[PDB]
Amino acid sequence: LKLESVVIVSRHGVRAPTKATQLMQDVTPDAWPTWPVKLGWLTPRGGELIAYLGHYQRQRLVADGLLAKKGCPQSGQVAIIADVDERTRKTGEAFAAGLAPDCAITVHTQADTSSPDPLFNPLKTGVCQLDNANVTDAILSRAGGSIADFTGHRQTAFRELERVLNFPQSNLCLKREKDESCSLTQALPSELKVSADNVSLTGAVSLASMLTEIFLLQQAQGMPEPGWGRITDSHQWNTLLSLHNAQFYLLQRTPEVARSRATPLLDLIKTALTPHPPQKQAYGVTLPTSVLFIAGHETNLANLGGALELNWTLPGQPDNTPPGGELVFERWRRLSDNSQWIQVSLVFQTLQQMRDKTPLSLNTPPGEVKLTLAGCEERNAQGMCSLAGFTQIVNEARIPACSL
Ligand SMILES: [K+]
């Protein structure tokens, strides 16, 4: 098996909280920690960690004979594509710096940087629209037929998150004027909101998913005592993040939402893995190429795993699609019979690897889970999906109206 091609779909790195609203301040008596960068901006530490990942992959790709040990990679050998958010553009710059330092590798973004990128947001940009009847039904089925059903299984994790927050002493909890229950699910009833370009949950679910991610972010960023020192063992970490992981299982991994949102990415990956005459398609980037790096969001990876049926969990990582988490796709050729095979994987730093700023390397690698396409009918011994089967899964998952 000769390794021929590699498409890495990565999440951005450790970033500042995206939002810092007055609801977040009102659910806890304690002050939220400041960050070194503006909201939603990648932090230097996040870049370095992403850089480590860039360095490990370089080594590993050398080892597989895909890249050259010494000096910068050949022209066109590496391609970086990144969404317009600073965090994603910086994450692309950070990866390059680690994969091949001091080489001038361009990070290719959408020209108008203040517009969404259709390749990362085909719904918010007009390419296609979710169907309300089918998307709501399907989300409600996944919830177990109702949102009440869903949030009923969440009371344990809300109890733990209420504790970490010190919710009873919170400005909101005093709803309780001088007759109303303090309970977090009862103060913020969750509500499924589906439209043509967006599906969301308003209430404790959306906010629990956000604050647990902030906790997790504080951990990877090295900040002293995340959760105000109220998170103390991995059990508590896994119980909190259950809320984040669970709000992505429902919204992002529903296929009637995942197939649509992810079709431009499916079409990009598809075109980067197929042996084909050289082609400068999107972002001025010629495909196919050796290593293609795509810097996106947790939603892009969730959508891909829902549409492709790649279900995974990251031992040592409470966040299922953590900062810098990578869905790696590789085309290997079998020399015996000259056939193309596809292999998928989740590469990642464990939360302790982020909080120790551990330097990755061949001998200090990151977590890595090997995935298999549920639907693939043509596997090798290694459990790789044939290029034909993988192509056929993609064509079945993709939603043509949502292609760029
Ligand atoms: K406001």
Resolution of the entry in angstroms: 2.6
| Signed CA dihedral, 46, 51, 52, 53: sign only | positive
Q: How far apart are CA 303 and CA 122, in angstroms?
A: 12
Ligand 1 centroid to residue 35 C-alpha, Å: 20
Cα dihedral 159→161→162→165 (10° resolution): 160
Token pair for residue 290?
Answer: 């050796």
Ligand 1 centroid to residue 21 C-alpha, Å: 7
Ligand 1 centroid to residue 202 C-alpha, Å: 17
Q: Which helix (H) or strand (E) holds 272?
A: helix 263-273
Q: How far apart are CA 318 and CA 221, in angstroms?
A: 15
Ligand 1 centroid to residue 18 C-alpha, Å: 14
CB 375 within 8 A of CB 393: yes
User: Residue 381: which residues within 8 A CB-CB, separation 6 or more?
Assistant: none
Cα dihedral 268→200→325→393 (10° resolution): -40
Q: How far apart are CA 395 and CA 404, in angstroms?
A: 15
Ligand 1 centroid to residue 250 C-alpha, Å: 28
Per the entry, the structure determination technique was X-ray
Ligand 1 centroid to residue 22 C-alpha, Å: 8
For residue 183, the domain's CATH number is 3.40.50.1240
Taking the CA atoms of the chain, what radius of gyration do you get in angstroms?
Answer: 21
CB 158 within 8 A of CB 208: yes
Please give the residue range of the domain that contains residue 180: 132-253
Q: Decide: helix, strand or coil at residue 184.
A: helix
Task: Report the DSSP pairing between strands 107-108 and 78-82.
Answer: parallel
Ligand 1 centroid to residue 26 C-alpha, Å: 14
